Write an enzyme that holds these catalytic residues in place. Structure first.
Site, PDB file in Angstrom:
ATOM      1  NE  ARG B 150      -3.847  -1.860  -0.141  1.00 27.78           N
ATOM      2  CZ  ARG B 150      -4.482  -3.115  -0.764  1.00 27.78           C
ATOM      3  NH1 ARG B 150      -3.491  -4.071  -0.953  1.00 27.78           N
ATOM      4  NH2 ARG B 150      -5.732  -3.119  -1.213  1.00 27.78           N
ATOM      5  CG  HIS B 326      -3.409 -14.923 -18.405  1.00 24.33           C
ATOM      6  ND1 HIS B 326      -3.975 -13.908 -18.765  1.00 24.33           N
ATOM      7  CD2 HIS B 326      -4.111 -15.511 -17.657  1.00 24.33           C
ATOM      8  CE1 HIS B 326      -4.967 -13.687 -18.297  1.00 24.33           C
ATOM      9  NE2 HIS B 326      -5.369 -14.828 -17.236  1.00 24.33           N
ATOM     10  N   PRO B 327      -3.486 -18.535 -19.949  1.00 23.47           N
ATOM     11  CG  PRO B 327      -4.558 -20.285 -19.103  1.00 23.47           C
ATOM     12  CD  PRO B 327      -4.108 -19.002 -18.529  1.00 23.47           C
ATOM     13  CG  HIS B 355     -13.430 -19.712 -19.213  1.00 21.00           C
ATOM     14  ND1 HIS B 355     -14.356 -19.168 -18.258  1.00 21.00           N
ATOM     15  CD2 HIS B 355     -12.702 -18.493 -19.557  1.00 21.00           C
ATOM     16  CE1 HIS B 355     -14.407 -17.952 -18.505  1.00 21.00           C
ATOM     17  NE2 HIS B 355     -13.222 -17.513 -18.960  1.00 21.00           N
ATOM     18  CD  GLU B 356      -9.072 -18.919 -22.172  1.00 28.63           C
ATOM     19  OE1 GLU B 356      -9.302 -18.486 -23.401  1.00 28.63           O
ATOM     20  OE2 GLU B 356      -9.170 -18.322 -20.883  1.00 28.63           O
ATOM     21  CD1 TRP B 458     -12.006   3.207  -2.306  1.00 24.94           C
ATOM     22  CD2 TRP B 458     -10.541   2.475  -1.057  1.00 24.94           C
ATOM     23  NE1 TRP B 458     -11.804   2.241  -2.840  1.00 24.94           N
ATOM     24  CE2 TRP B 458     -10.604   1.583  -2.046  1.00 24.94           C
ATOM     25  CE3 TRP B 458      -9.650   2.083   0.006  1.00 24.94           C
ATOM     26  CZ2 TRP B 458     -10.146   0.351  -2.286  1.00 24.94           C
ATOM     27  CZ3 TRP B 458      -8.960   0.948  -0.388  1.00 24.94           C
ATOM     28  CH2 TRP B 458      -9.091  -0.130  -1.045  1.00 24.94           C
ATOM     29  CG  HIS B 486      -8.583  -5.553 -13.297  1.00 25.47           C
ATOM     30  ND1 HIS B 486      -8.090  -6.317 -12.226  1.00 25.47           N
ATOM     31  CD2 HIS B 486      -8.868  -6.316 -14.295  1.00 25.47           C
ATOM     32  CE1 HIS B 486      -8.227  -7.603 -12.947  1.00 25.47           C
ATOM     33  NE2 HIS B 486      -8.741  -7.577 -13.999  1.00 25.47           N
TER      34      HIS B 486
END
Ligand SMILES: *[C@@H]1O[C@H](CO)[C@@H](O)[C@H](O)[C@H]1NC(C)=O
Ligand SMILES: *[C@@H]1O[C@H](CO)[C@@H](O)[C@H](O)[C@H]1NC(C)=O
Lengths: 99, 593
Positions: B150, B326-327, B355-356, B458, B486
């Site tokens: 942090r 990563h797939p 999933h893929e 926050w 993200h």
């Protein structure tokens, strides 16, 4: 990039007609004057074939055989059935139409 | 006439866009399965040429006026093409924004957080801190790693976020949007027909409505997790207070799935892991993807292409070429569908392969659409149609059908409950975090949160919405959201929320199509062609229609519904009622240790 196709044309093709013209397709009202851009497209687009494409986009070679009959004598006539020849026996013969 | 000009413009644009997008995607695939400087630079000019072509066609496409276009597919294509994005700015401001984004990416990828008095064992997050959050049980070491990451992110990323917010707001208001959150909410906007009209400002209230009744299930799950962590940590967690931020199994608390050994209902019952059965039968990655293809042709989806088997890498190659672990499922264009996966022989890689392949079937189905409409209906649909396959591939019925699980299996309620609890920690626990993060980003970009009242707001909403208190007080020199991947790399986050809702909506639709008479979590959609046709009515659409019409085509509803989510977790919700009678469901915003 050596395989091309026509995407734009003013009117539909007549049967068995070709168009090898490279005139710029005018899609709008402004005159193209041979220079591409907006509402002025080159009619020939490239079939950018690559071996990793899907089957519906992989290149297919097509040959179209068109048969015509005219008043002329038909001089394209394919193989005619022939059997072995048997001699010294009473058989039904047919040579060149003569039976 | 204007509409015919737009039709000829789109006809000229589509083939060159497909060619350049295939070149860019093929260069990206060549970099991703073979990492070197030559593939990196080939990807650089390929992406540069494709982006430059897209922008110079979008400048011409913005000259069209949409008030005289009657055909909705042409209007939707011109809407998709006219999204200029960050190119609406000047060169100086766009260069500053790209510099800020790239230095955010390079400071997130190379951030290092290490110890007082022990400088030599000095760690990146990706090998070591995620392992500390997943495995370690010591309170002080987790407090160490949480407060250090942090600090060593927020102190360096607070002013970067200060100009990042202003430049992204300028980017949005250059494209006639109110704020950058409204720019992100314009991905959910639907304009076609009557009754299918969806607005940006509607979306926030729809999210709050769908969060109004997941809240009791999350409150019961939070109370149970808090009680089991009180069993773990004896005096450090209050019974009526909020959870500490560093005891949630992740770096940020995004997924609660690392709390499953700590919060197991029945430790003596094993899980539904079938990896050892794969090793005993000698399964490899080819058989995994063939079983996934067998599942998809049993449900009614088409077979995999020959180029899929020819061009995909499904194993660590060990040929000296670096790969990304990563797939990712790749739709390169011109009917090219690939999967990049470093498949080990595990159950999790089996579900990831399903999933893929769900992603691949989604990409394959809208291949008949034009190029600008070869996307998802929104950002949540693409991952939801893979998550439904990940749901159906994990059932005991599917594993018993294909011989991975024995025919005399007895599925008692204890392993069903702890499977549902693991699914809740993966799935339900990320929803208040997602709604919090997107609500905070929307209020920051809108300007509803003042600039000098960021951090204490926050930690107010984390005391209010998520129910998680800070371990130590933070002033406004920190930037505590920016520790997440993200947000430091400019990604929308509400797609996971809509993924979670659409996943169980699609699951009830496909299980009602397949005529399954049991509970939803035991449902398998195998050997049901009518469910496959009900699915392919949506997958063939793309975004040619509004997403409300596709949603009505699947589930018969035009909005987000969380009644399927509560119906999936109904035995678990009853169980959570049964062990929360003596406890206190809910949290207090006042800081209790
Ligand atoms: C990976 O890239 C290098 C770069 O020269 C090349 O030599 C090698 O053949 C590539 N590998 C494959 C499998 O194409
Ligand atoms: C579905 O069909 C496959 C085809 O062989 C079969 O093996 C499988 O047992 C079927 N599933 C059910 C539940 O009948």
């Amino acid at each position: 990039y050596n395989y091309l196709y026509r995407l734009f044309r003013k009117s539909n093709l007549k049967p068995f007609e070709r168009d090898i013209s490279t005139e710029i397709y005018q899609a709008g009202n402004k005159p193209c004057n041979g220079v591409a851009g907006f509402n002025c497209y080159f009619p020939l687009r490239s079939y950018s074939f690559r071996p990793t494409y899907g089957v519906g986009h992989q290149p297919y070679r097509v040959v179209v055989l068109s048969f015509e009959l005219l008043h002329a004598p038909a001089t394209v006539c394919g193989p005619k059935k022939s059997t072995n020849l048997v001699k010294n026996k009473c058989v039904n013969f047919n040579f060149n139409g003569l039976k | 006439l204007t509409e015919e000009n737009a039709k000829t413009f789109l006809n000229n644009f589509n083939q060159e866009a497909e060619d350049l997008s295939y070149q860019s995607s093929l260069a990206s695939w060549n970099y991703n399965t073979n990492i070197t400087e030559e593939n990196a630079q080939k990807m650089s000019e390929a992406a540069a040429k494709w982006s430059a072509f897209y922008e110079e066609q979008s400048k011409t496409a913005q000259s069209f006026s949409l008030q005289e276009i009657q055909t909705p597919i042409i209007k939707r294509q011109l809407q998709a093409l006219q999204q200029s994005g960050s190119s609406a700015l000047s060169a100086d401001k766009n260069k500053q924004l790209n510099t800020i984004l790239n230095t955010m990416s390079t400071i997130y990828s190379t951030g290092k957080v290490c110890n007082p008095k022990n400088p030599q064992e000095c760690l990146l997050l990706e090998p070591g801190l995620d392992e500390i959050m997943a495995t370690s049980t010591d309170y002080n070491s987790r407090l160490w790693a949480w407060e250090g990451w942090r600090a060593e992110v927020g102190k360096q990323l607070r002013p970067l976020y200060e100009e990042y917010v202003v430049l992204k707001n300028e980017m949005a208001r250059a494209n006639n949007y109110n704020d950058y959150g409204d720019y992100w909410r314009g991905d959910y906007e639907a304009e076609g027909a009557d009754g299918y009209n969806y607005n940006r400002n509607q979306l926030i209230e729809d999210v709050e409505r769908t969060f109004a009744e997941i809240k009791p299930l999350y409150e019961h799950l939070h109370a149970y997790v808090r009680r089991k962590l009180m069993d773990t940590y004896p005096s450090y967690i209050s019974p009526t207070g909020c959870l500490p931020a560093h005891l949630l199994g992740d770096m940020w608390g995004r997924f609660w799935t690392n709390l499953y050994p700590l919060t197991v209902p029945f430790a003596q019952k094993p899980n539904i892991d079938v990896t050892d059965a794969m090793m005993n039968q000698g399964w490899d990655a080819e058989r995994i993807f063939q079983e996934a293809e067998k599942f998809f042709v049993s449900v009614g989806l088409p077979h995999m292409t020959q180029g899929f088997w020819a061009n995909s890498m499904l194993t660590e190659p060990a040929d000296g070429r670096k790969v990304v672990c990563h797939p990712t499922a790749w739709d390169l264009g011109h009917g090219d569908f690939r999967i990049k996966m470093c498949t080990k022989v595990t159950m999790d890689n089996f579900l990831t392969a399903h999933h893929e392949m769900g992603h691949i079937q989604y990409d394959m189905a809208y291949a008949r659409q034009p190029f600008l409409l070869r996307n998802g209906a929104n950002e949540g649909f693409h991952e939801a149609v893979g998550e439904i396959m990940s749901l159906s591939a994990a059932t005991p019925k599917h594993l018993k059908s294909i011989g991975l699980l024995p025919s005399d299996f007895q599925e008692d309620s204890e392993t069903e409950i702890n499977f549902l609890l693991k699914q809740a920690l993966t799935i339900v626990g990320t929803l208040p975090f997602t709604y919090m993060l997107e609500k905070w980003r929307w209020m920051v970009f809108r300007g509803e949160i003042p600039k000098e009242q960021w951090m204490k707001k926050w930690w107010e909403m984390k005391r209010e919405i998520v129910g998680v208190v800070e371990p130590l007080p933070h002033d406004e020199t920190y930037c505590d959201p920016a520790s997440l991947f993200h947000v430091s790399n400019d990604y929308s986050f509400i797609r996971y929320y809509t993924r979670t809702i659409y996943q169980f909506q699609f699951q009830e639709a496909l299980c009602q199509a397949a005529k399954y008479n049991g509970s939803l979590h035991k449902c398998d959609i195998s050997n049901s062609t009518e469910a496959g046709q009900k699915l392919l009515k949506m997958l063939s659409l793309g975004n040619s229609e509004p997403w409300t019409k596709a949603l009505e085509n699947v589930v018969g509803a035009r909005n987000m519904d969380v009644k399927p989510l509560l119906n999936y977790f109904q035995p678990l919700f009853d169980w959570l009622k049964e062990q929360n009678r003596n406890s206190f469901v809910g949290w207090n915003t006042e800081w209790s240790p």
